[PDB]
Amino acid sequence: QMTRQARRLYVGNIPFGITEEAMMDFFNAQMRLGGLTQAPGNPVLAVQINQDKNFAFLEFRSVDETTQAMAFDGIIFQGQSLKIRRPHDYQPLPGMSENPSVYVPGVVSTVVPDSAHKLFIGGLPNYLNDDQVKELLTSFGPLKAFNLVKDSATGLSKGYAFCEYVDINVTDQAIAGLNGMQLGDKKLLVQRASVGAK
Ligand code: NA
Ligand code: NA
Numbered sequence: 249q250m251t252r253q254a255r256r257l258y259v260g261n262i263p264f265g266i267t268e269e270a271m272m273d274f275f276n277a278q279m280r281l282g283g284l285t286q287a288p289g290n291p292v293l294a295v296q297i298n299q300d301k302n303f304a305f306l307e308f309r310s311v312d313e314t315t316q317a318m319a320f321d322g323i324i325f326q327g328q329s330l331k332i333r334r335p336h337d338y339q340p341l342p343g344m345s346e347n348p349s350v351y352v353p354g355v356v357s358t359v360v361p362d363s364a365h366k367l368f369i370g371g372l373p374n375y376l377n378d379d380q381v382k383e384l385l386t387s388f389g390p391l392k393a394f395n396l397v398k399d400s401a402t403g404l405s406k407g408y409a410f411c412e413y414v415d416i417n418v419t420d421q422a423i424a425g426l427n428g429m430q431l432g433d434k435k436l437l438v439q440r441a442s443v444g445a446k
Contacts, residue, residue, distance in 0.1 A: 253338045254311045255293075257318065260303040260331035261358075261378070264403050268295040271304055274325055275317070282352055284316040291317070302403065311341060319348045322358045322394065327377035329394065331358045356382065360393040360410040365419045367411050368441040369426070371434045372396075374405040381409055388422040390414040410441055 262271070276290040285291050287310070294307040308314040321332040340346045360366055372381060378396045385391060396409040413419060419440075427438040 250339055251311070251341070252307075253335045254341055254344070255308050255314050256335050256338075257306045257308070257314060258303060258331075258333045258335060259306055260333070261328050261398065262297065262302050262304055262330065263326040263328050264299075264302075266297065266326070268297055268304075271295045271297065271306070275306060275320075278320065278323065279313070279317060282320075284313065284319065284350060284352075286310065286312055286316070301400065302398075305335070311344065315344070315346070315348050316350055317348075319350045319352050320355060322356045323352075324379050324382075327379045329356070329358050329378040329382075329396070331395075356391045357393045358395045360395055360412055362441070362445075363412065364440070364442075365412055365416055366393075366441045367419065367422065368408065368437070368439055368444060369411065370408040370437040370444075371431070372405060372407045372409065372436070373432055373434060374399075374407040376405065381405075385411055385413075385422070385426075388413065388418050388425060 272292050272295050275292045279285050279291050291308050291313040292306055293309050295304055297304045308317060318332050322329045381396050382391060382394055392412045392414045394409065394411040397406045398404060399406045413422065423438045426436050429436045
């Protein structure tokens with residue numbers, strides 16, 4: 249019921265062509281290797297893929313492993329940052345908090361909250377994947393959050409992104425270092441996202 253929705257997650261921005269088996273094997277292996285499972289065996293029970301909108305719902309064997317799984321928001325799978333979110337009709341169970349107790353080194357969250365230091369990157373070649381765009385930005389250091397915007401129709405980048413660095417103080421060096429860089433046949437725009445936000 250309510251309990252089943254506390255055992256499901258939306259997984260968006262899934263790569264083209266992924267089977268249910270590959271998604272399951274990836275999550276099961278990574279959760280166990282990552283130490284996120286709380287009992288022996290595989291934590292994922294089921295996977296339902298919608299290839300038309302590039303998302304899956306994952307179903308887990310337990311409520312607490314579902315919550316821990318949210319620490320994989322932004323994990324890279326075949327070059328793409330998976331977006332992990334609660335079901336819209338999730339309601340937390342009494343005596344449970346809805347966010348995880350664990351941080352997985354190297355996972356960069358896809359949630360980029362509005363802030364003084366959040367950046368907008370525009371002008372990206374739209375054939376560069378999430379990891380390839382992250383590798384660009386991380387020439388100024390580790391990212392704290394990042395999302396590349398995709399076109400729900402080409403299965404493809406709309407050519408702009410948002411991010412936030414771990415180090416506050418690199419923000420101006422990043423704009424300075426990237427604003428206007430030529431990239432194949434296009435020049436980069438980089439600025440604080442508050443500047444062109446509708
Ligand atoms: Na709990
Ligand atoms: Na546009």
